[PDB]
């Protein structure tokens, strides 16, 4: 029936920087990852059928001692759900979530998750994508990092 998608992070292709990036690899056909009447190119979820969809994302950040010290500096773990036209320049923010964090403590492990969800009017050709602040901090688990959409009503 209606279009939908539940994309889980491609555990094998997460960028390694500390700078904000658009995630460009998600699974769409394994585990809980699934897609229907929607297109996934490179981190871009293309709407193939006009309508009002509920869009959501769960992002998990994690750090472990063995990976090295957490430098004493500015830490803001963010997720931005972005909308772009498959043929119209700059993307725009639909949803934003996150938190400034201090992970300098002497604990072995640090963990943090963000969730965002909203009802949006989408057109075929429009694309939904995910941006995160610290990619190397991303948790690769399918139950941890993912985004999706499902149509709830026609335009």
């Amino acid at each position: 029936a209606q279009p939908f998608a539940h994309l889980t992070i491609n555990a094998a292709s997460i960028p390694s920087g500390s700078h904000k990036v658009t995630l460009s690899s998600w699974y769409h056909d394994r585990g809980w990852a699934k897609i229907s009447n929607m297109t996934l190119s490179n981190g871009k979820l293309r709407v193939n059928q006009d309508g009002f969809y509920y869009l959501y994302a769960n992002i998990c950040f994690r750090h472990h001692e063995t990976s090295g010290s957490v430098p004493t500096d500015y830490l803001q773990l963010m997720v931005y759900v972005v909308k772009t036209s498959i043929k119209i320049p700059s993307s725009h923010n639909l949803m934003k979530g996150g938190s400034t964090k201090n992970w300098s403590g002497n604990s072995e492990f640090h963990f943090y998750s963000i969730n965002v969800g909203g009802f949006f009017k989408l057109r075929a050709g429009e694309e939904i994508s995910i941006q995160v602040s610290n990619p190397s901090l991303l948790d690769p688990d399918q139950d941890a990092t993912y985004f999706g959409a499902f149509k709830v009503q026609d335009i």
């Binding site: 555990a11 056909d29 394994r30 585990g31 809980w32 994690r62 750090h63 472990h64 001692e65 063995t66 990976s67 072995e108 492990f109 963990f111 190397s136 901090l137 948790d139 690769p140 688990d141 399918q142």
Partner: protein
């Protein structure tokens, strides 16, 4: 009818799928279950009725986790916390192994992915440090230093040797 290969659908005793594959189609009244093999990085390890195979655990280095058994279409991937840590089910994370205090030492051999268990040093041995790896050291033999034993040792400190 048994389960080690069967289940019930449209009044029929249909055959269950074998590890390595999932059921693509439930049995119809005219044919039986259509079981297709698990795709890449997926697995099912039991006779099942699943419409999709289970995805393998990620042994995230970022969690100090490493693959002990890569797993396959029949068996799940097994992970372990790397040296110095052990898996904690409450946090579902690799926790730092606990340190044995002076007077005790780490029981050996050290179990992979398990917390260190401490035991007190017995007569003739000591530990004067906090460590999650070290076992009790035996007291120094003063004669190897060309000396005599000035002071007896304890569980917390080594013997004291003095040049006569």
């Amino acid at each position: 009818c048994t389960q080690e290969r069967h289940y019930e659908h449209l009044g029929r005793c249909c055959s269950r799928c074998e590890p390595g594959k999932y059921l693509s189609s439930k049995c119809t009244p005219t044919s039986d279950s259509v079981c297709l093999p698990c795709g890449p990085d997926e697995y099912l390890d039991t006779w099942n009725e699943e419409d999709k195979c289970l995805l393998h655990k990620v042994c995230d280095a970022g969690k100090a986790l490493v693959a002990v058994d890569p797993g396959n279409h029949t068996a799940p991937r097994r992970c372990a916390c790397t040296a110095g840590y052990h898996w904690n089910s409450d946090c579902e994370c690799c926790r730092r192994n606990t340190e044995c205090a002076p007077g005790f030492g780490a029981q050996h051999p050290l179990q992979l992915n398990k917390d260190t268990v401490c035991t007190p040093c017995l007569l003739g041995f000591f530990s004067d440090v906090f460590s999650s790896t070290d076992k009790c050291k035996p007291w120094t033999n003063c004669t190897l230093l060309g000396k005599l034993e000035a002071h007896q040792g304890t569980t917390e400190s080594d013997v004291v040797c003095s040049s006569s």
